[PDB]
Design an enzyme around this catalytic site. Structure first.
Site, PDB file in Angstrom:
ATOM      1  N   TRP A 100       0.800  -1.219   0.000  1.00 19.43           N
ATOM      2  CA  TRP A 100       0.000   0.000   0.000  1.00 19.43           C
ATOM      3  C   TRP A 100       0.832   1.268   0.000  1.00 19.43           C
ATOM      4  O   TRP A 100       0.481   2.242  -0.654  1.00 19.43           O
ATOM      5  CB  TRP A 100      -0.987  -0.022   1.157  1.00 19.43           C
ATOM      6  N   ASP A 172      -1.927   6.645   5.704  1.00 15.21           N
ATOM      7  CA  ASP A 172      -2.993   5.760   5.248  1.00 15.21           C
ATOM      8  C   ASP A 172      -3.372   4.781   6.364  1.00 15.21           C
ATOM      9  O   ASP A 172      -2.799   3.697   6.478  1.00 15.21           O
ATOM     10  CB  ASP A 172      -2.476   5.024   4.012  1.00 15.21           C
ATOM     11  N   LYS A 196     -12.633  -1.659   6.194  1.00 18.45           N
ATOM     12  CA  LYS A 196     -11.769  -2.517   6.999  1.00 18.45           C
ATOM     13  C   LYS A 196     -12.161  -2.480   8.475  1.00 18.45           C
ATOM     14  O   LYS A 196     -12.788  -3.401   8.999  1.00 18.45           O
ATOM     15  CB  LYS A 196     -10.306  -2.085   6.863  1.00 18.45           C
TER      16      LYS A 196
END
Ligand SMILES: Cc1ncc(COP(=O)(O)O)c(CN[C@@](C)(CCC(=O)O)C(=O)O)c1O
Lengths: 360, 360
Positions: A100, A172, A196
């Site tokens: 990511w 993030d 999530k």
């Protein structure tokens, strides 16, 4: 009972879902669904404000930070950050230490020349991350970006940033937010997709420091413009009303259960139980350093990969879903977010021991 | 019962909602919600493909058109179209004939210098739109953009485009799609937010002609890049899974009820009933030309605006919600989408007559 170990979309709190279901067709005695109500109506606006208020109470978000709700998910943000806070500088610092963290860099290339810092290192054969005090930042950089929780790698950086006024930190938190208390004041921008650890897919939460607004590139689509979103109270256009609503229920469920401080304690036990089973066994193995082990996403390989299929069939029949590791990595991966009860991480560990016993 | 005349988010088919409610916590015997399942799982992927297939059957979308599902809503598209199909050109034709047609132009300015054409005209004191054969297009233009259905104005342009094979038509069908059969082959791009006539908020459907791909501006965020979305089957990042799921249920509900041809037939008698009451009454009045009257959104002013407040209280008590007109225009507005049954429209007209016979 079934325990969903999916990594995103993820399992939602049973109570939250049991409520959403009941008032699905008659929400608030209105005789209609929240999905059918106008976003402008006072009924929804109260949900939206209450949602933000609870969220701020949960993380102790100081008055100088705006909290936005937008479309696009986490990747939409890989574009939004550069488009909004890059101002007029031509570069930005990006710390790669996972899938990511790297994906964000790839999108950023569209808008600037990002200085990449490879924070990845291998210590004792175990995958670890260099400490922040060793990170190379540049002078000209508009901001520094990094990912505190790699969902695929099972890597986590819990270190609190301490770069000083001059540096703007963007992060993030998609797969870790609300799992532990954090000092928001250290960051400039904190974004996170809801699928999530918060609620459902479709919604994205962003926390921006107010002085960072008003710099947006002209090319930034208005729905992504932080200033536009703030001025309209995240209601520039029709938002994901149902998603925003569920997030509200989750935030309430959290305060009702002790806030992030209690969640942090429970998350700790869940992680220790699982990682305890993996370390003490020869059959299972995780190759991440103690200092960087994520408590949200826990990837593990079997000693004998030929048993992967059987592990998945038997775990599924046992009521343990989505244990397959990410596509590009293989192996297994148990995602144990806030919604996943310790009772569930136990059911998994009970199964794992039993599998190792009769197949290992 | 309750009849929701909201204009977006809108009323969803009662059957679709009953079902969604039933299997909210145990979808497909999986023991989990569709919201908790991963978009990479085969379970969801089957929902997603079936969703697109049904959609194509409904509108007879030929093989050379891609059907995308993205985040951002209609206003995300005001940015996406210019970013994607503007190619290497610096100008585009935009036809203003309403609030939405104008909003699109406002966003387009960020990416080019748009040639605006004011198609608005007043005929016999009634608001009408100039016929397409009278529209001024430019030579260099990368495409021509317009909105066949103005949700706030109650204006509709049903004329089928017939400009040069050289001209690329982009249209905003957010509030009219699936209401009547259309010849997709005439268009280059057709976009529409789901919250009006399809399903819930959060999802947006786009129909692109294949030869238009591969021109996207480098500045276009990847989640909005048509080419990226097509290559990944609208699964570049986590999509609004629940929204996509409901849309699927709606599409099935439609085929189950006779498709777009039957819907068109019913929509016609719902529009005629309502507009019949308004024209035959002195108390209510709509000022739009018959040739341009939308069958989806029907705005109407009262003869005596002092009764607006009472009309809203009484209509609400009667189980008729969201009848308030838009802020910008004022007055009233009944949105009668596919989900709104004839019985619901009759209930409204029955009320409007009664109210008049008692206050007019
Ligand atoms: C025809 C049309 N095009 C675009 C939009 C914008 O949709 P999103 O806000 O991006 O999802 C709309 C929206 N129409 C609304 C719902 C606008 C309400 C508001 O004040 O935002 C309406 O009620 O007319 C279109 O209709």
């Amino acid at each position: 009972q079934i325990f969903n170990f999916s990594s995103g979309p993820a399992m939602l709190p049973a109570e939250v879902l049991k409520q959403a279901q009941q008032e699905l067709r008659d929400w608030n005695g209105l005789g209609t669904s929240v999905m059918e109500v106008s976003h402008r109506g006072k009924e929804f606006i109260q949900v939206a404000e209450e949602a933000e208020k609870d969220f701020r109470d949960l993380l102790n978000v100081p008055s100088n930070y705006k909290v936005l709700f937008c479309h696009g998910g986490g990747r939409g943000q890989f574009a939004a950050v550069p488009l909004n806070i890059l101002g007029d500088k031509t570069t930005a610092d990006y710390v790669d230490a996972g899938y990511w963290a790297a994906s964000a860099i790839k999108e950023a290339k569209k808008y600037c020349t990002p200085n990449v810092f490879d924070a990845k290192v291998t210590v004792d054969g175990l995958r670890a991350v260099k400490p922040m005090r060793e990170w190379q930042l540049s002078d000209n950089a508009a901001y520094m970006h990094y990912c505190p929780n790699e969902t695929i790698d099972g890597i986590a950086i819990d270190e609190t940033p301490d770069f000083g006024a001059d540096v703007v930190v963007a992060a993030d938190f998609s797969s870790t937010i609300l799992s532990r208390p954090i000092d928001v004041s250290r960051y400039g921008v904190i974004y996170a997709g809801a699928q999530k650890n918060i609620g459902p897919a479709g919604l994205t939460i962003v926390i921006v420091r107010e002085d960072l607004l008003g710099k947006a590139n002209i090319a930034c689509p208005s729905i992504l413009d932080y200033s536009i979103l703030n001025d309209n109270g995240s209601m520039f256009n029709t938002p994901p009303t149902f998603a925003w609503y569920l997030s509200g229920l989750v935030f309430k469920w959290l305060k009702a259960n002790g806030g992030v401080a209690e969640m942090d304690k429970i998350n700790q036990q869940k992680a220790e139980l699982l990682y305890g089973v993996i370390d003490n066994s020869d059959f299972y193995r995780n190759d991440v350093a103690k200092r960087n082990r994520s408590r949200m996403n826990v990837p593990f390989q079997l000693a004998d990969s030929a048993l992967d299929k059987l592990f998945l069939e038997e775990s599924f029949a046992a009521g343990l879903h989505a244990l397959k590791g990410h596509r590009v990595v293989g192996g297994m991966r148990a995602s144990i977010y806030n919604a996943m009860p310790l009772e569930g991480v136990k059911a998994l560990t009970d199964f794992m021991v039993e599998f190792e016993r009769r197949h290992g």
